[PDB]
């Protein structure tokens, strides 16, 4: 409904695309005989195509005039699954990765040989940091409040202005 789009369930162009894909495979199907590995594999291909189209219809995606799904990314919760939920998932995973890296760097510097610790990873403690980074949003907030996330400004080199 938004921006003149319509759901893919009642989308004639979407249905035509589904039938075109099905007809293309079934044509290619003529070369091979019944019961062969290629024949059964193409049957899997047709089933997966039909399943994908049915799932796209059921999920409530909006299909444009071209008959392809269009994703709405503005904040509306009617289409949260398009961007908002994957967005938070990625943000959590990326912060996990960054926190594991940062905490391992904090450890490795305190070591006697930080330069060799960077190219030969202490895996027993590195896995520990990867595990402990699961709670990074609280850990990051705690370190920020304790003044240990940011290095002060005049303790970092800066070039001649």
């Amino acid at each position: 409904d938004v921006s003149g789009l319509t759901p893919c369930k009642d989308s004639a162009v979407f249905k035509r695309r589904l039938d075109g894909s099905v007809k293309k495979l079934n044509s290619r199907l003529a070369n091979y005989t019944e019961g062969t590995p290629a024949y059964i594999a193409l049957e899997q291909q047709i089933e997966q195509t039909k399943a994908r189209f049915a799932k796209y219809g059921e999920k409530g995606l909006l299909c444009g005039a071209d008959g392809l799904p269009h994703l709405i990314a503005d904040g509306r919760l009617d289409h949260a699954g398009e961007f908002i939920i994957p967005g938070f998932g990625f943000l959590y995973i990326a912060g996990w990765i960054g926190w594991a890296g940062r905490s391992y760097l904090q450890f490795s510097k305190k070591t006697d040989k930080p330069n060799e610790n960077e190219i030969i990873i202490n895996v027993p403690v590195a896995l520990g940091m990867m595990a402990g980074a699961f709670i990074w949003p609280l850990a990051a907030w705690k370190e920020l409040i304790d003044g240990k996330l940011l290095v002060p400004g005049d303790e970092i080199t800066v070039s001649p202005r």
Binding site: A51, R52, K55, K59, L71, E82, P86, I119, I120, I121
Partner: protein
């Protein structure tokens, strides 16, 4: 095997290759079991 071979396997490129192969395997198997997921 030994401390030496464990250190070598703990070297940076070997660990990156192993970890990225594991990640690619996870992504590929997730694609196999939940194929064609355009949205949540």
């Amino acid at each position: 095997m030994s401390n030496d071979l464990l250190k070598y396997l703990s070297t940076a490129p070997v660990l990156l290759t192993a970890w990225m192969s594991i990640t690619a395997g996870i992504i590929i198997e997730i694609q196999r079991f939940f194929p064609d997921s355009l949205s949540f």
